[PDB]
Amino acid sequence: MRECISIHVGQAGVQIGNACWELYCLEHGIQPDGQMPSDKTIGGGDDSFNTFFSETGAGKHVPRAVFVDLEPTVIDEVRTGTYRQLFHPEQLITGKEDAANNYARGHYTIGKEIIDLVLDRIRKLADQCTGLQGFLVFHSFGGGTGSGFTSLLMERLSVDYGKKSKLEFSIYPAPQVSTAVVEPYNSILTTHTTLEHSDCAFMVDNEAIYDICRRNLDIERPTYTNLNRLISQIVSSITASLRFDGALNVDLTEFQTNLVPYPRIHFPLATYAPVISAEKAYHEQLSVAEITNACFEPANQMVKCDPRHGKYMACCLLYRGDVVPKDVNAAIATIKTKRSIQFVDWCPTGFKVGINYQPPTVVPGGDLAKVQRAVCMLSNTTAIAEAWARLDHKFDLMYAKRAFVHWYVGEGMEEGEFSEAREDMAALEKDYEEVGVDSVEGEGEEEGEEY
Amino acid sequence: ASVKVAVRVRPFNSREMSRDSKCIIQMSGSTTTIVNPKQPKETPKSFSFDYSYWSHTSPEDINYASQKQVYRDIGEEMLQHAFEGYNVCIFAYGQTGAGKSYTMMGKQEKDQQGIIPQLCEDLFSRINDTTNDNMSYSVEVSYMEIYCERVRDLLNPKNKGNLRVREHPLLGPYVEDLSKLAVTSYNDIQDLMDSGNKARTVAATNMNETSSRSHAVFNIIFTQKRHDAETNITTEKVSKISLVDLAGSERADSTGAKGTRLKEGANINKSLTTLGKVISALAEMDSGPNKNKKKKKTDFIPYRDSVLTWLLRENLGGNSRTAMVAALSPADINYDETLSTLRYADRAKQIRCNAVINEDPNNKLIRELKDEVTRLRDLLYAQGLG
Amino acid sequence: KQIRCNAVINEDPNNKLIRELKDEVTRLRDLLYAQGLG
Amino acid sequence: MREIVHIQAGQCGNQIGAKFWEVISDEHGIDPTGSYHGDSDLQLERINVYYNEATGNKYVPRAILVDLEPGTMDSVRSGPFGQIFRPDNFVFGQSGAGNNWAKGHYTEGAELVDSVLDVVRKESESCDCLQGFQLTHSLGGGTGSGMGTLLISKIREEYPDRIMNTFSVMPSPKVSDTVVEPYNATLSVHQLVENTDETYCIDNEALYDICFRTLKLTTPTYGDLNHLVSATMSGVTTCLRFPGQLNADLRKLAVNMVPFPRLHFFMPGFAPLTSRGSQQYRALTVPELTQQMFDSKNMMAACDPRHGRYLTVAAIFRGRMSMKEVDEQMLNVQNKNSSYFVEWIPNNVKTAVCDIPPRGLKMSATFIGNSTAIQELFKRISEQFTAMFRRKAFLHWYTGEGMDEMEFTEAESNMNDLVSEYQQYQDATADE
């Protein structure tokens, strides 16, 4: 029973959770009311996969989800929506104001009196679980709740459970586009928790996904629904290895064993290759080589960063559908001969491969074409440093004059939690710069004894 | 420094007296002569060793060697080498039931004690006599056996488990979780010796009533310290004294072994055969590069084929000064076996070690640089430039 | 009055001694080779 | 009555064992449900080598299945021959090793090793005269490598006099499926060189090369690799089961192939292999099998024999054929390729002949080589090992589970010593 508990914090977290749970319900043939007529039609089976859904006596299936936010609006949209009967009635929503783009308000003042209930319900979910693999936390940098309350919850979880993996999916601020004036402060103040407590953090950018939607899917006016659906596809590709049979299955521990060389560099990028519209699904073969090559194109990255400016440290490919090992081997072999893709000299292997038989599903009303093959790549590289550096600059431009600071100090913080965070960012950037340097020439300086 | 080689011949035992008692071993000076009983017409083959010892008759004075004689000749020399700061080893060799237990351990109740007790007593006397305000000494003991490719500890109380052999990157092989006991007086180490000899595995066979069943290694770690508050360095010297008693080769026909006693013997023979190869291999290499030209291209020594050769990697060659004591049997019936020992002994002297021994490489570098500064300053002063 | 603090550095005495002795050896050798005494 | 206990560990070992039990089961004539439906009288004569006899005229294979992830076990049970195995031998836990050798050997496997040894002891006690074991696993993986090494160590501790075989799938230069393969491979090879009598080397690159070039398949899967490997395993131990003009027990192969104890890494091969299109053209005879066995491209280890020397080789033929032709062909192979054999082992070719071929063939042959070229493989791993160990690329995962740098260093030193021990005999002209 490869059980995984999902936690959604903030508006971005709740909406990505809506998309994710729509996809999960469609994958296993669960109706919006929690019933599964597939078993009744067939007679019995294991289709109620215990990764996400828990089966009660009467044939209903309750998801292993925990939605949290400080605004009643975002989750009251779910309590009276299509999926109102699917979730347990307990949704952990503080009937008060919100963090208000304020890390201090979400971490110290209002984050209290809601953390205890959240931890209690997480404990109740964990008690029902046997062989719990880890957590999947969804949130967004730049928001008050998704920064402060996520920090508090991650701290408490690291205190309590400790050894269980805690993966992170977060929406990083874009370089140019933004939706708040105090995004850099909230983003920078979360580095301590996203570093010390998480085991692997996946970052995505709205500008990159908008570019992908405009260029590949030919959607000129996308909304957040398309972005959430793409992120849901990414998470499903990650988690499919422990729900369906396959030639090579990759658990959540193999992830961390293969992708993170050192504890402090666990920030891999993610990407999905066969992102294509229904009309353009024709005129294309969609073979293993094509999707595998498209995973490495800088235009297809989900974060505004150029891999050509850095070096690849580790790669994990997860294939779905009608795929065979020899095509994957040929794709990796032809990739290794390209000079535009550089690997660090101290990781000569540089690839982890997993294959799953279940092909990706299509959500009605969606925009992704039905395909026979797919691949999700997760790549730990050094180009991500750039994504920090720009944001770091922005932070300085506001902290030189102490703008917007009185709101933060008026809720419980002092200015030093505003420098300590900056120094931690600087140290992280120094680490990323140091790891990517080539080994010094003949690293034992030089050698050669008599004979 | 070449390996030192001693050979010794023992008197007749009951098995020899009951059967034909014709002697074949003769000794004169440093020369040991063996004569083929089956071919009296043949040449009296002879070998020149560093030391040879005749223990056949005690009243007479024909180069008779008591235990104290061999002890002075080999063990006292090697102990003096140890005091100068050199890792040191003495190991026994030959065939089953010849002389190893008598030579190395001896009979404790009698005055004819083996090399290990006399070395330990002289070492304790020297550390007690030469003690001073500045000088100081420390000593530590351990004792292990190799039974069937498995290491066991004797000085420790009953530990049914078998220890694990490991490899420090700089110091080479060692035995993990080995009870290294601190000792302070001759009586205490004597008690440890008695307990260790009791703990060994010994079984009776036709060739000998107390045939040893396991190789044994006795290690003494000695530390020599000089205290000075101004210039001198404490822990000036550290040395390792290794006395090795090997179970001898056996033949199933004469031994009469069956079942477990046979299987043990097989392992013993294996642990000897590999050892012989190593000795031969080592000799040729240290003969070849030294004499041939100096090429030093590549030569492989099969150290890893047995745990005995693995643990003694630094003893048979490298960073130690080593002596080899061969035990002979005067019986005519034993000739075809006895000569074999001599052959390997004849090769044993060819082996050449490489021992320097230092400590605290930071102090080594500092001392080297300071000595260079002093030498250059003295040269400048002598030539009028200082 | 925020001012530059710099890093307080305390070198190891062993490394200092080794470096000083190496420099002294080099200087004395360059002196001795100069006066054609080496 | 000689017979073998069988152990399977990891995904690769489990799948290869499943395919192997389907092949052996045909030769002996066994229904998937367990009943016997053969035609020849000699199939049941020595069936006890692999199969225990149940009450209802059924036959239960003497297999042990080991893993830490339950999923593979399900794939064995929900298969063509899933019901043949007794449920009591399915030993498994939860929370698999995750490609971490430390978890497999020290932390997780240390708890399941007791149960696995209990089942192994139960199977071995009922044996009339236990010959030896054989283990199938992958060195470059997680639970497979670690638990295989641990079980090998324990069994050699408890059964020192019996043969301990091993079929290992090691990393490849180009084919790589895990980032941390060198660490697992190095530690596994350090464990195997001490505690094993025979170790057959298998590489995915060589099997894919055989499939593409020899068998001309277009879309090979792991089924074909398992097919080739299982054919090799059935070929190795033919002579315990069926009569022959000149038999060859496992101990005979061990004695004749191993000159020194640490040199027991073999290169396997099988013949004939014809692609299903050229079957009507070639004549099948002993010279053709001899030519195909010694061909470089037919080996399963991806190490060219031309880059070294053959310390020893063994040829096990199956079929009705003349001994004179076999001896003449082996002598001709020795004489013509004079430079690829060592000069101090005269007649370094073991020969065995069995009178019962496979069911669909008139003749067949298996080749077990022992050559210095295998050093290349180890060298490659060692190179990659250094490239990660010098910077400590992924060492925190291993050190967090109760290891240290010293084990890595000693494993690397042992591997280098083995690599040096092969080269010694590799060069010609022993004098200078």
Ligand SMILES: CC(=O)O[C@H]1C(=O)[C@@]2(C)[C@H]([C@H](OC(=O)c3ccccc3)[C@]3(O)C[C@H](OC(=O)[C@H](O)[C@@H](NC(=O)c4ccccc4)c4ccccc4)C(C)=C1C3(C)C)[C@]1(OC(C)=O)CO[C@@H]1C[C@@H]2O
């Ligand atoms: C001769 C004929 O008309 O059919 C042959 C055949 O065409 C060939 C091509 C067979 C065929 O092999 C393959 O096509 C193949 C594909 C992938 C991997 C391995 C083999 C055959 O499939 C394989 C099959 O092999 C057997 O039946 C053996 O007994 C084999 N057992 C099994 O394959 C087997 C598989 C599943 C269940 C039960 C038995 C065996 C081999 C060694 C030791 C013991 C058993 C045979 C003779 C043939 C076909 C069917 C075409 C060959 O294989 C073997 C092992 O015999 C390919 O090289 C040989 C040469 C044969 O001529």
Ligand SMILES: Nc1nc2c(ncn2[C@@H]2O[C@H](COP(=O)(O)OP(=O)(O)OP(=O)(O)O)[C@@H](O)[C@H]2O)c(=O)[nH]1
């Ligand atoms: N991809 C994606 N991003 C979103 C979505 N909703 C919000 N975001 C991101 O979230 C950022 C705003 O922070 P929020 O997470 O909404 O803050 P919050 O969770 O509402 O918490 P409060 O600030 O206290 O209200 C914006 O910059 C968006 O980029 C969404 O539906 N999809």
Ligand SMILES: Nc1ncnc2c1ncn2[C@@H]1O[C@H](COP(=O)(O)OP(=O)(O)NP(=O)(O)O)[C@@H](O)[C@H]1O
């Ligand atoms: N030179 C000697 N003078 C007097 N007695 C001796 C002499 N050499 C051996 N003995 C005795 O003869 C017997 C055989 O010697 P012993 O030392 O036990 O053989 P060993 O070296 O132990 N052979 P093994 O222990 O199997 O490797 C013992 O009782 C010894 O005390």
Ligand SMILES: Nc1nc2c(ncn2[C@@H]2O[C@H](COP(=O)(O)OP(=O)(O)O)[C@@H](O)[C@H]2O)c(=O)[nH]1
């Ligand atoms: N020949 C063969 N090799 C396999 C198969 N499955 C996996 N492998 C190899 O095994 C390696 C992965 O090891 P794995 O089975 O995951 O080890 P485990 O995790 O301990 O069970 C890969 O490098 C593959 O090349 C198979 O079915 N056949």
Ligand SMILES: [Mg+2]
């Ligand atoms: Mg909000």
Ligand SMILES: [Mg+2]
């Ligand atoms: Mg003795």
